[PDB]
């Protein structure tokens, strides 16, 4: 069950007509675009703080904000209670 390739002239089994045609007409522009995209997303510095840093910052905020957190309520900026 070999069908002649309309794009290369070779013979492929009929189980691989559609995939051979889709791959055969794949623009190298797709390859260069994918390479560019890979370069961009693997080189940009992270903007927001990591998760552990976020947790530590929230812990410091809770320590220094007793009007929201904790049991006892000290002033807005104080940490003793």
């Amino acid at each position: 069950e070999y069908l002649v390739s309309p794009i290369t002239g070779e013979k492929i089994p009929a189980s691989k007509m559609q995939e051979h045609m889709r791959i055969g007409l794949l623009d190298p522009r797709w390859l260069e675009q994918r390479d560019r995209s890979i370069r961009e997303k693997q080189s940009d510095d992270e903007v927001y703080a990591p998760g552990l840093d976020i947790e530590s910052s929230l812990k410091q905020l809770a320590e220094r904000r007793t009007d929201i957190f904790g049991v006892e309520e000290t002033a807005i900026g104080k940490k003793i209670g």
Partner: protein
């Protein structure tokens, strides 16, 4: 420079299959997959790299003992007919010719809501069996077209249904009367009183085209698309000879009225006349192009006619072991070819030209074209009385013809 190498790389054909690409890369020794290398990058790397670089004996004896006396009796009958004055033979000849030219469409009955593939006359010429593609076989009264005993039939399209030669005459209605072939290869036996099959002959894993009894009524001949034809013995309830002589599928089988010979016409474009007494191909038909769809041994005992896709009906003479006349019958694929059952009075031909024609058996000249129908004439049969003609068609109707 390297620009010309890049130009060469474009012209190189590389398989689009990932497994084939990996196999080719491993054959050259290069790593199959680099880090972060997908199938497209693998194909690109391959492109760059390529750019760089004992029952049979008993049955035969019984057939011979049944056939030799019949062949002899036919021989003395022919001798007596020769002794008959030539004026009487000529006179009955033009009487038959005038009777045939007066044929008209006697009746037209819808066999089923699907095309009718076969029609067969009962031995008493009072019942007609029609094989339909809907998987239903029906029995019709001959003098008046009305259904009298339907059959549950097969599941696929029914190829051919043939009455037992002794049916409706000698053997009881409850016994086997009919054999029908389907498009899945199944063969089922029938009785005139039971709609359900009496028995189900098996072994044909591939579609069987035609099924016809031996004239003795003891052996049933089946032709399969396995490049084979099989003979089924009713008494033994077991197939006898699965002969394999055709290069392609075997379509039609015709038996000798004497019972000594059997003729198989298949899609090989060639016919073979097997010997039922010895199981050897006595005579090999040759001359037809394309598949042969019809064959019938003449009651004379020495004439064979075959119909094929050549739009021709070749008549074969057994005495000379060669073709004698080629009848260019009809302008479409010829299917049904049949002589007068009693003697060689005439030849009836049917084709996909939605028409049927009648030819003098000796002279092979047209007498009356059974014009009519609106679909391809799949099959035809002539009653034992000889004045009844039935032609089923793709038109979902079968028609009767009698002289008026």
């Amino acid at each position: 420079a390297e620009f010309e190498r890049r130009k060469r790389a474009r012209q190189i054909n590389v398989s689009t299959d990932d497994s084939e690409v990996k196999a080719c890369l491993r054959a050259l020794g290069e790593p199959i997959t680099l880090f972060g290398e997908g199938p497209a990058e693998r194909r690109e790397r391959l492109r760059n790299i390529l750019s760089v670089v004992n029952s049979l004996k008993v049955a035969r004896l019984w057939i011979a003992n049944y056939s030799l006396p019949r062949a002899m009796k036919r021989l003395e009958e022919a001798r007596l007919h020769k002794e008959i004055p030539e004026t009487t033979r000529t006179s009955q000849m033009q009487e038959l010719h005038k009777s045939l030219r007066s044929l008209n469409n006697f009746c037209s009955q819808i066999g089923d809501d699907r095309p009718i593939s076969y029609c067969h006359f009962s031995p008493n010429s009072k019942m007609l069996a029609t094989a339909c593609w809907s998987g239903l076989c029906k029995l019709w009264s001959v003098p008046d077209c009305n259904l009298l005993h339907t059959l549950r039939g097969h599941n696929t399209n029914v190829g051919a249904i043939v009455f037992h030669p002794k049916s409706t005459v000698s053997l009881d209605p409850k016994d086997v009367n009919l054999a029908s072939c389907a498009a899945d290869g199944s063969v089922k036996l029938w009785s005139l009183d039971s709609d359900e099959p009496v028995a189900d002959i098996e072994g044909h894993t591939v579609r069987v085209a035609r099924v016809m009894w031996h004239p003795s009524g003891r052996f049933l001949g089946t032709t399969c698309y396995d490049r084979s034809w099989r003979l089924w013995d009713l008494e033994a309830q077991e197939e006898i000879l699965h002969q394999e002589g055709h290069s392609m599928g075997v379509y039609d089988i015709a038996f000798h009225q004497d019972g000594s010979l059997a003729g198989t016409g298949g899609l090989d474009a060639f016919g073979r006349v097997w010997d039922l007494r010895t199981g050897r191909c006595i005579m090999f038909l040759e001359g037809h192009l394309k598949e042969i769809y019809g064959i019938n041994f003449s009651p004379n005992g020495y004439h064979i006619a075959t119909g094929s896709g050549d739009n021709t009906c070749k008549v074969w003479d057994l005495r000379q072991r060669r073709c004698v006349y080629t009848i260019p019958a009809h302008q479409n694929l010829v299917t049904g070819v049949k002589f007068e059952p009693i003697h060689g009075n005439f030849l009836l031909t049917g084709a996909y030209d939605n028409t049927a024609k009648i030819w003098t058996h000796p002279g092979w000249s047209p007498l009356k074209t059974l014009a009519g129908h609106e679909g391809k004439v799949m099959g035809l049969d002539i009653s034992s009385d000889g004045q009844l003609i039935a032609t089923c068609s793709y038109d979902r109707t079968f028609k009767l013809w009698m002289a008026e």
